Design a binder for these strands. Structure first.
Length: 434
RNA sequence: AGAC
């Protein structure tokens, strides 16, 4: 019933064939019933996996993650969640899709949350149908979904720093382990400890994934030590997961600044994705998930919820209507719809700051709502002293567009612009006008 | 930390 103007949530457990089996079945039916359809992948890596499953079916890939020959007659488009939301913020022709399919519809990136709000609103207006696919539908707080094989779940004291004794079960194990850590720095410490104990370790994060993930498929390894990059798009031939049950997330303090808070407890959805790396083979019983604490009861602290509202308040629907967040996650923010709707010129600035500046949503919003123009970078240098950005333990400096060397000290502090080397490099280029 |  794809023509029915309703939202279907497909709760598809890890390993149940969401991409390899269910998605092609949906897409074939959409094509046969001549429905203009958009497929929303959470990441480039997942978009490339979808192309393998959809090979032969006529799909227009709107991502450079895939390069196949298009016929020009395709009625099914595929793009990443954030591409979709970005396109909604531009004064562009928003195509009139009859059917929206979102894979990994638990994803709490602010563009993903915004996309679900836009899509569910369109469905509630009678304008479209949608399908949301995930192991953990928004609203559901279960960390232990079904699996292809039974998983032994055991809560234990999980080491979170290098250890010299007291965790023998970690290194006495004869199988292969995927270990989820909150940060790159924390994983480097655990990995070094394991390597000293004689184990073969591969480390995964956003920065290293392209090169290192392939090694997990082609080299022998004992441990994969990974951030939450491996919650989506990543599968392993493993027998055990060790889970800190911790992550780092951006949090807005006092409405005034953003910190990268934590390590803090992961959500149920993320814990389910982490556990879901094992128990995948019905012919390989006995896989184990060893976890270190509870999941987050509260989630409303994360900045992504307010950021999603900032995006949605600035996406034009016909006649200036504003979309709501998807209902099961609408209570995660306490703001009235339209609070963050910017007037025309400031809205253009906000959009440009995000798309060309690569600024976080919250930061882009502060600058745009201040009346600052996109190209005026004075604000990067005129904050209070406690906003001075440090690099190698001394104040970071930039050569500006005006040929002066100035200390980086932004008027609004968002820790995401300087929390790793790539982010700081980008923000320095921004501050320089380059 | 993740993301286009």
């Amino acid at each position: 019933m794809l023509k029915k103007k309703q939202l279907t949530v497909l709760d598809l457990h890890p390993g149940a064939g969401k991409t390899r089996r269910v998605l092609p079945e949906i897409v074939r039916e959409a094509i046969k019933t001549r429905l203009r359809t958009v497929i929303l992948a959470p990441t480039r890596v997942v978009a490339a996996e979808m192309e393998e499953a959809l090979r032969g079916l006529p799909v227009r890939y709107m991502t450079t993650a895939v390069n196949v020959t298009h016929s020009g007659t395709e009625i099914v488009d595929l793009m990443c969640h954030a591409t979709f939301t970005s396109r909604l913020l531009q004064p562009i022709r928003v195509p009139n899709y009859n059917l929206y399919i979102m894979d990994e519809a638990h994803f709490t990136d602010p563009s993903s949350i915004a996309a679900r709000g836009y899509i569910s609103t369109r469905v509630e207006m009678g304008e479209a149908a949608a399908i949301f696919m995930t192991a953990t539908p928004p609203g559901t707080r279960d960390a232990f979904p079904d699996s292809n094989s039974p998983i032994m779940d055991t809560e234990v004291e999980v080491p979170e720093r290098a250890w010299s004794s007291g965790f023998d079960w970690v290194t006495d194990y004869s199988g292969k382990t995927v270990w989820f850590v909150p940060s790159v720095r924390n994983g480097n410490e655990i990995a070094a400890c394991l390597t000293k104990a004689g184990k073969r370790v591969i480390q995964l994060s956003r920065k290293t994934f392209e090169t290192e993930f392939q090694k997990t498929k082609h080299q022998e390894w004992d441990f994969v030590v990974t951030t939450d990059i491996s919650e989506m798009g990543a599968n392993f031939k493993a027998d055990r997961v060790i889970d800190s049950r911790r992550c780092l997330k951006p949090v807005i303090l006092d409405g005034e600044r953003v910190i990268l808070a934590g390590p803090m407890p992961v959500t149920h959805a993320s814990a389910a994705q982490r556990r879901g790396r094992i128990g995948r083979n019905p012919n390989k019983p006995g896989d184990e998930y060893l976890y270190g604490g509870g999941c987050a009861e509260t989630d409303e602290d994360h900045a992504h919820w307010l950021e999603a509202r900032m995006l949605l308040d600035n996406i034009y629907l016909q006649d200036g209507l504003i979309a709501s967040l998807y209902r099961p996650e609408a209570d995660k923010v306490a703001a009235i719809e339209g609070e963050f709707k910017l007037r025309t010129e400031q809205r253009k600035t906000f959009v440009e700051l995000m798309k060309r500046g690569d600024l976080p949503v919250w930061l882009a919003y502060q600058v745009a709502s201040a009346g600052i123009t996109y190209t005026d970078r004075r604000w990067c240098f005129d904050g209070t002293t406690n906003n001075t950005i440090m690099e190698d333990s001394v104040p970071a400096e930039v050569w500006t567009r005006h040929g002066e060397k100035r200390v980086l000290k932004p008027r609004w502090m968002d820790a995401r612009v300087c929390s790793d080397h790539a982010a700081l490099k980008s923000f320095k280029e921004f501050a320089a006008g380059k």
